[PDB]
A paper describes a structure:
Exo-β-mannosidases, hydrolysing non-reducing terminal β-d-mannopyranosidic linkages, are widely distributed carbohydrate-degrading enzymes. We show that these probes covalently label exo-β-mannosidases from GH families 2, 5, and 164. Structural studies of the resulting complexes support a canonical mechanism-based mode of action in which the active site nucleophile attacks the pseudoanomeric centre to form a stable ester linkage, mimicking the glycosyl enzyme intermediate.
No significant inhibition of BtMan2A could be detected following incubation with 1 or 2, but the enzyme was 85% inhibited by 3, again indicating performance enhancement attributable to the N-octylazido linker. The electron density for several aromatic residues lining the entrance to the active site pocket, notably W470, W533, and Y537 were extremely diffuse, hindering modelling and suggesting a high degree of mobility in the complex. Comparisons of the labelled enzyme structure to the previously determined structures of complexes with 2,4-dinitrophenyl 2-deoxy-2-fluoro-β-d-mannoside (2FMan, non-covalent/pre-catalytic) and noeuromycin, show that the ligand has migrated significantly away from the expected position of the GEI (ESI Fig. 3†). Reorientation of the catalytic nucleophile breaks the hydrogen bond with O2, allowing relaxation of the ring conformation. This makes space for a water molecule to interact with R393. Due to the interaction of these aromatic rings with the alkyl linker, we hypothesized that hydrophobic interactions related to the presence of the octyl linker drive this active site rearrangement. We thus conclude that there exists a more fundamental instability in the GEI structure of BtMan2A, possibly explaining earlier failures to trap it.
Author numbering: 28 to 864
Write the structure that this text describes.
C-alpha cells in the first residue's frame, strides 16, 4: 500500500543464439534450455541419453530482448528503478543504448536507476549472456592448475571461477545443464520521493512479558530537495493492530538510516513444527510525505529465540539448537534444487514439498551449499510451517579462489542474501560451505598439487570461510550462529573426532558399513548420512523405454553419478533381502531397503539424545529423474524412506532395538509435556495371526518431555526359539491411564531374507470418486512391506510401505486431481514374498 506503480517485464521477450539474427518467443523468468525445448530445438534433456545431446548450449552466447512503453505521466515520476532479482550469470544489460550493468553473480539482485535513460513511447532492453564456460576458459588457463571439483562434469573445472549454482555443472545425483537467463523476475518501479531499500526487524530481547524490536530502515531519496516525512511501523496480528510507532524526519538526498523502537507486551511466540503454532506478526513500515504513502515494505515476523549451543563438554563439543529456551532435537533433511531449470519450479511445487516435510514431522531443513540461496517463497513457507532453516553459503566440496576480485563478488552475494533472508523466523544459522575443509585435509587433494599451491588453497580457505563470511554475518546478522564448514571437525574415518560437532557419516554407503553401525557410531549431530534407491517404475518409465530396464544397464549407470553406485545397492540388499530376478521387483525391494536401513539410523539418533541432538538425512528431494539418496523423487512420489522418516520422527515413538540376542524398548518423546501413568503392552504374533505366549504389560511409565528412556529389556534366549524368531513379530502399543493409544510399533526378530513368510493374497475393496480412491486391504496372513503402486504420477497416500498384519484390516486413501470417477484406478500391490519362489 504505497503510491508506486510496478510494471512486471514478464511477457513479450525473445531470445537468439548470438549472431544468428534468428529471434523466437521466450519465457521470462526462465532458462535458455527451456526456451529451446519449447521450440523443439532441444530434446527432453531428462529422457534417456539426451544428456550428451544438450551440452552444446553451454558453449554458445544467448541474447534476450523485450520492448515496453513508458507514458509521459510515468516519465514524470520522481524516480524509476529497474530490478533484476536474478541473472545467470555473465550478463550485459542494455537499455536505450546505455550499458546499465555487467552482471557477474547469479545470487545477487541488482537495483538500477533508469529514469534518465527511459524514453516516452518505446523502450528497448537487450541482455547479452556470455557462456560461463567460454567466459572462464582464459581465467582457467591463467590459473595453471585445475581445482579438484569432481562434481563439475568436465575435464576443466570452471565452476569454481563463477558465482553460479554449483550443481548446474553436474553432481553425483545431478544432470549437467550449465544454463543462462533471467532466472528471477524483472520489475520496473515508478515512484515518488524514495524507496525503502531495506527493512530489518531486529529483535533486541524476548521474554514472556515483552518483545523489544528495533525497526531499521534504509530509505533512498532520489529527489534533490529535503523532504519532511513521517515514518510509521504498524505491528498487526491477523489484521488487528497490536502497536503503532512513528517518527518525524527530514529525508536528505541519497541514503537515510531510520531506527524506530517498538515493543510487543505478552508476545505470542513462533514455535517450531511439533511444539505449537508458527505465529507470524505483520510488520509494515510506511514513509508518509503529507497525505501520500510514498513507500511501504512489510515482513512477517516470528518472535522467538534460536540459540546454537556449540560448547566443550565431557563428550567433546555439543552442537544443538535451543528454541525459545528449550533444547530441540532436530529432525529433517538436506534440501537440493527442485529442478535442473530453477524457474520451472512453481508455487505449487514449493508448497507440496513443504507439505511433505511438515507431514513427515520435520522441524529442520538444511539448504545445502551446491544449490541456490532459495527464493523468498521457500523461506516464507518454512516460516508458516515451523521448519528451522540451516543456510549454507553456496560453496561445496572443492577449495575456491580467494583473490581480491573473487572475495569482492562473494561479499556482494553475502550482503545481498543475508539482508534478503534475515527477517525470516525460520532462519536458524549460516554455514560457510559443505565439506571444503574435510576435502582439503582428507579427500587428499594434497597429493594432487605442489606444496606451494596447497598452502595457497589453505590460506585461501581462511580468507573466505574464517574471515570474510564470519565478519559479514557478524555485521548484518549479529545474533545468528555461523560455522565455517559442515562438518566442522568430525571426520567419519576418525572415531575420536565424533564427539566434536556435527558429523557427515560416509561409513554407511561409501564405507559399505551395515545400517547396524549407526547404532554404535554416534555423532553429536548428524548433518549428513544417506542411502540410494532407484525411484519407482512410473518414474523410470519417464526417462527409460521398457527395453532399457537393467541393474547396471547403459541408462541405469547414466542415471547414477555416484559410479559405485548400482553395485552398493545389490551388496546391501543381499545382506537383508533375497535379491529378486525381475528389475521391477528389485526396484521395489530397493525402496523397502533404503526405507528400513535409514529409519534404523534416524531411530538410533533420537534414541541417543542427549549425546546426539539431531539428524538431517541426505537427501529430501531430486532435481530430475535419477537414482539418488532422495526420500521424494523428482515427480513428488514418496519413496518408502519418506513414509519411514515420518514414522521415525513421530513426536512419540516406541523404539524396540534388538542387539546381542537381547531386546530393549525405549520411549522417545519430543512433546513439551511429560506423560504419566502410561502402559507399554507387547505380544508375540505369528504370521497366521495366532498370539504366542502371554501379553507382556509394563505399567506405571513416566514419558518425560524431550527424552529417550529404556522401559524394558528381555534376553531372547528362553523367550523365543530361533524358529519362532523367523515365524512371528512383536506388536508394541503405548496407552495413557484411560487405555487410549498414543503410539504403536511392530518389531521383526530376524532379517527379512531369513523370515518364513507365508504365501498370501492381499485382497482389497476400492471406493473411487473425483480426486480420490479409498482402498480397504486384507490378508489373513502377514504381507511384508506392501507397496500399493499406481501408474498416476504424484498420487498421494495416507500410508504405504507398511506391513499388513495377519487378519488386520487397513484403510488407505489415495488422492490426485487426475482421479476421475469411472476410470477405475489401476492398482498393483507388491509384498516381499511375491518377489521370489
Ligand atoms: Br531514477
Ligand atoms: Br535506484
Ligand atoms: Br541518515
Ligand atoms: Br523468485
Ligand atoms: Br599444482
Ligand atoms: Br569462523
Ligand atoms: Br540380535
Ligand atoms: Cl533476542
Ligand atoms: Cl519523532
Ligand atoms: Cl612447491
Ligand atoms: Cl503425540
Ligand atoms: Cl532392532
Ligand atoms: Cl497410534
Amino acid at each position: 500500500n504505497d503510491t508506486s506503480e510496478v510494471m512486471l517485464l514478464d511477457t513479450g521477450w525473445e531470445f537468439s543464439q548470438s549472431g544468428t539474427e534468428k529471434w523466437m518467443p521466450a519465457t521470462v523468468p526462465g532458462t535458455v534450455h527451456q526456451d529451446l525445448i519449447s521450440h523443439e530445438l532441444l530434446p527432453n534433456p531428462f529422457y534417456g541419453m539426451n544428456e550428451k545431446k544438450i551440452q552444446w548450449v553451454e558453449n554458445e552466447d544467448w541474447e534476450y530482448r523485450t520492448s515496453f512503453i513508458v507514458s509521459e505521466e510515468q516519465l514524470n515520476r520522481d524516480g524509476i528503478q529497474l530490478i533484476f532479482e536474478g541473472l545467470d550469470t555473465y550478463a550485459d544489460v542494455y537499455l536505450n543504448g546505455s550499458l546499465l550493468l555487467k552482471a557477474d553473480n547469479m545470487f545477487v539482485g541488482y537495483t538500477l536507476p533508469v529514469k534518465s535513460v527511459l524514453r516516452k513511447g518505446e523502450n528497448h532492453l537487450y541482455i547479452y549472456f556470455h557462456s560461463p564456460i567460454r567466459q572462464t576458459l582464459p581465467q582457467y588457463a591463467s590459473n595453471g592448475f585445475n581445482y579438484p571439483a569432481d562434481n563439475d562434469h568436465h575435464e576443466k573445472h570452471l565452476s569454481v571461477f563463477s558465482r553460479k549454482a554449483p550443481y548446474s555443472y553436474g553432481w553425483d545425483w545431478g544432470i549437467r545443464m550449465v544454463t543462462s537467463g533471467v532466472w528471477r523476475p524483472v520489475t520496473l518501479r515508478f515512484y515518488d520521493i524514495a524507496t525503502i531499500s531495506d527493512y530489518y526487524v531486529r529483535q533486541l530481547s524476548l521474554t514472556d512479558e515483552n518483545a523489544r524490536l528495533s525497526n531499521e530502515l534504509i530509505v533512498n531519496q532520489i529527489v534533490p530537495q529535503k523532504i519532511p516525512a513521517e515514518v510509521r511501523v504498524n505491528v498487526s496480528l491477523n489484521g488487528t493492530t497490536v502497536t503503532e510507532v512513528k517518527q518525524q524526519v527530514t529525508l536528505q538526498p541519497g541514503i537515510n538510516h531510520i531506527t524506530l523502537p517498538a515493543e510487543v507486551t505478552n508476545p505470542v511466540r513462533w514455535m517450531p513444527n511439533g511444539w505449537g503454532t508458527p505465529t507470524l506478526y505483520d510488520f509494515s513500515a510506511q514513509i508518509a510525505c503529507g497525505d501520500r504513502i510514498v513507500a511501504e515494505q512489510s515482513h512477517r515476523i516470528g518472535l522467538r529465540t534460536i540459540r546454537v549451543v556449540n560448547e566443550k563438554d565431557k563428550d567433546g563439543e555439543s552442537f544443538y539448537f535451543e528454541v525459545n529456551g528449550i533444547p530441540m532435537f532436530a529432525k529433517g533433511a538436506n534440501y537440493i534444487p527442485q529442478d535442473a531449470l530453477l524457474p520451472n519450479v512453481t508455487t505449487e511445487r514449493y508448497q507440496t514439498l513443504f507439505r511433505d516435510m511438515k507431514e513427515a514431522n520435520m522441524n529442520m531443513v538444511r539448504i545445502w551449499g551446491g544449490g541456490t540461496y532459495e527464493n523468498n517463497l521457500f523461506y516464507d513457507l518454512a516460516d508458516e510451517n515451523g521448519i528451522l532453516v540451516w543456510q549454507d553459503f553456496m560453496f561445496a566440496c572443492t577449495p575456491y579462489p580467494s583473490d581480491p576480485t573473487f572475495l569482492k563478488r562473494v561479499e556482494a552475494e553475502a550482503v545481498y542474501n543475508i539482508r534478503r533472508l534475515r527477517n525470516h523466523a525460520s532462519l536458524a544459522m549460516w554455514c560457510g560451505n559443505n565439506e571444503i575443509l574435510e576435502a582439503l585435509k582428507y579427500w587428499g587433494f594434497e597429493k594432487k598439487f605442489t606444496p606451494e599451491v596447497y598452502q595457497g588453497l589453505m590460506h585461501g580457505y581462511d580468507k573466505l570461510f574464517r574471515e570474510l563470511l564470519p565478519s559479514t554475518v557478524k555485521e548484518f546478522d549479529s545474533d545468528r550462529f555461523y560455522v565455517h564448514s559442515s562438518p566442522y571437525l568430525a571426520n567419519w574415518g576418525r572415531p575420536e573426532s565424533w564427539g566434536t560437532g556435527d558429523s557427515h557419516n560416509w561409513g554407511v554407503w561409501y564405507g559399505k558399513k551395515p545400517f547396524e553401525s549407526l547404532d554404535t557410531d554416534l555423532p553429536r549431530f548428524m548433518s549428513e548420512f544417506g542411502f540410494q534407491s532407484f525411484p519407482e517404475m512410473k518414474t523410470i518409465a519417464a526417462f527409460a523405454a521398457p527395453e532399457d530396464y537393467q541393474i547396471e544397464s547403459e541408462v541405469m549407470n547414466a542415471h547414477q553419478k555416484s559410479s559405485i553406485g548400482n553395485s552398493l545397492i545389490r551388496t546391501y540388499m543381499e545382506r537383508d533381502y533375497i535379491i529378486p530376478e525381475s528389475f521391477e521387483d528389485f526396484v521395489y525391494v530397493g525402496l523397502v531397503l533404503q526405507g528400513q536401513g535409514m529409519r534404523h539410523g534416524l531411530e538410533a539418533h533420537r534414541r541417543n539424545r542427549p549425546y546426539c541432538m539431531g539428524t538431517l538425512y541426505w537427501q529430501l528431494n531430486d532435481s530430475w529423474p535419477v537414482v539418488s539418496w532422495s526420500s521424494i523423487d523428482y515427480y513428488g512420489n514418496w519413496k518408502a524412506l519418506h513414509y519411514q522418516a515420518k514414522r521415525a520422527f513421530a513426536p512419540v515413538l516406541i523404539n524396540p532395538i534388538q542387539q546381542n540376542d537381547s531386546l530393549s524398548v525405549y520411549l522417545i518423546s519430543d512433546r513439551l509435556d511429560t506423560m504419566e501413568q502410561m502402559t507399554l503392552e507387547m505380544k508375540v504374533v505369528d504370521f497366521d495371526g495366532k498370539t504366542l505366549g502371554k501379553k507382556i504389560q509394563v505399567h506405571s511409565l513416566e514419558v518425560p518431555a524431550n527424552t529417550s528412556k529404556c522401559v524394558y529389556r528381555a534376553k531372547l534366549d528362553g523367550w523365543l526359539t530361533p524358529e519362532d524368531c523367523r515365524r512371528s513379530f512383536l506388536k508394541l502399543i503405548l496407552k495413557d491411564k484411560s487405555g487410549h493409544q498414543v503410539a504403536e510399533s511392530v518389531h521383526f526378530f530376524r532379517k527379512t531374507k531369513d523370515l518364513q513368510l507365508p504365501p498370501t493374497s492381499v485382497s482389497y475393496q476400492m471406493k473411487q470418486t473425483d480426486g480420490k480412491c479409498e482402498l480397504t486391504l486384507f490378508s489373513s496372513m502377514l504381507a511384508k512391506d506392501i507397496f500399493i503402486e499406481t501408474p498416476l504420477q504424484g498420487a498421494r497416500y495416507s500410508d504405504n510401505f507398511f506391513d499388513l498384519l495377519p487378519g488386520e484390516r487397513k484403510k488407505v486413501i489415495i488422492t490426485s486431481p487426475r482421479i476421475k470417477k469411472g476410470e477405475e484406478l489401476p492398482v498393483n500391490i507388491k509384498h516381499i514374498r511375491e518377489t521370489y519362489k
